[PDB]
């Protein structure tokens, strides 16, 4: 019925990944507990910092990338929801399921990553854990790993950059391709088509 009618939350920021130094890290900033009532409320006062946030919803967790002042994630784990920020629930700026995309506004305090216009094909994948997976482009919108592993451990990492040797933003980790649970290559939606949709 209308009145018993519940709202989604938000997409809340828990993490980041740290590569500001020598050695990358993912760093916790919010535990699960306030993370469900931050998702309920969207008001989210935790200062925010770096390139790469580890999000979550009540239900799944993964990545969202700063990239041009925008936040950007895969729809897949974000859907249309809002995400939190310190005056509350924020709506996407940028939707678009056919691409596996959405974007918010980057959020205060977020550095973000220039787009590459290197035309590189020696890029770096970065996962949730923060491990940096050297991975060949292959296509537009795809790249073979180097060194293959189950899929496990890509799994959480949607919504993660790509990037080229200089550091620029080349795309974001979107889908991941296995034979007998081995990823062998990854999808992803290149900066270009973000750049098209800006
Ligand atoms: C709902 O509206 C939409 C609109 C457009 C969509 N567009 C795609 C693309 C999609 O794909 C799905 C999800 C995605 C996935 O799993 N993403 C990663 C990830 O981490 N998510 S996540 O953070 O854990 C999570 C779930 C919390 C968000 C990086 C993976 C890591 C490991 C993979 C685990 C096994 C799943 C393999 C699958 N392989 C695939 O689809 O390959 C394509 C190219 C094929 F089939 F053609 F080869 C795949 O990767 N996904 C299957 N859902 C869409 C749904
Ligand atoms: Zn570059």
Redesign the pocket.
């Known amino acids: 019925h209308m009145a018993s009618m519940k709202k989604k939350g938000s997409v809340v920021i828990v993490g980041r990944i740290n590569l500001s130094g020598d050695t990358a890290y993912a760093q916790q900033t919010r535990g699960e507990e306030g993370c469900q009532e931050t998702s309920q409320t969207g008001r989210d006062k935790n200062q925010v910092e770096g390139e790469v946030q580890i999000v979550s919803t009540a239900t799944?967790?993964?990545?969202a990338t700063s990239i041009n002042g925008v936040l950007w994630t895969?729809?897949?784990?974000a859907?249309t929801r809002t995400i939190a920020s310190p005056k509350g629930p924020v709506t996407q700026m940028y939707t678009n399921?056919?691409?596996?995309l959405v974007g918010w506004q980057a959020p205060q305090g977020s550095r973000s990553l220039t787009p590459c216009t290197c035309g590189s094909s020696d890029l770096y994948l970065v996962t949730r854990h923060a491990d940096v997976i050297p991975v060949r482009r292959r296509g537009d919108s795809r790249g073979s790993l180097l060194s293959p592993r189950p899929?496990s451990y890509?799994?959480?990492?949607?919504?993660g950059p790509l990037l080229c040797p200089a550091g620029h933003a080349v795309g974001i980790?979107?889908?991941?391709?296995?034979t007998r649970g081995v990823?062998k290559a990854?999808?992803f939606i290149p900066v270009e088509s973000l750049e098209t949709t800006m």
């Open positions: 799944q967790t993964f990545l895969v729809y897949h784990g859907g399921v056919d691409k596996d899929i890509l799994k959480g990492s949607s919504g980790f979107r889908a991941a391709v296995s990823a990854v999808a």
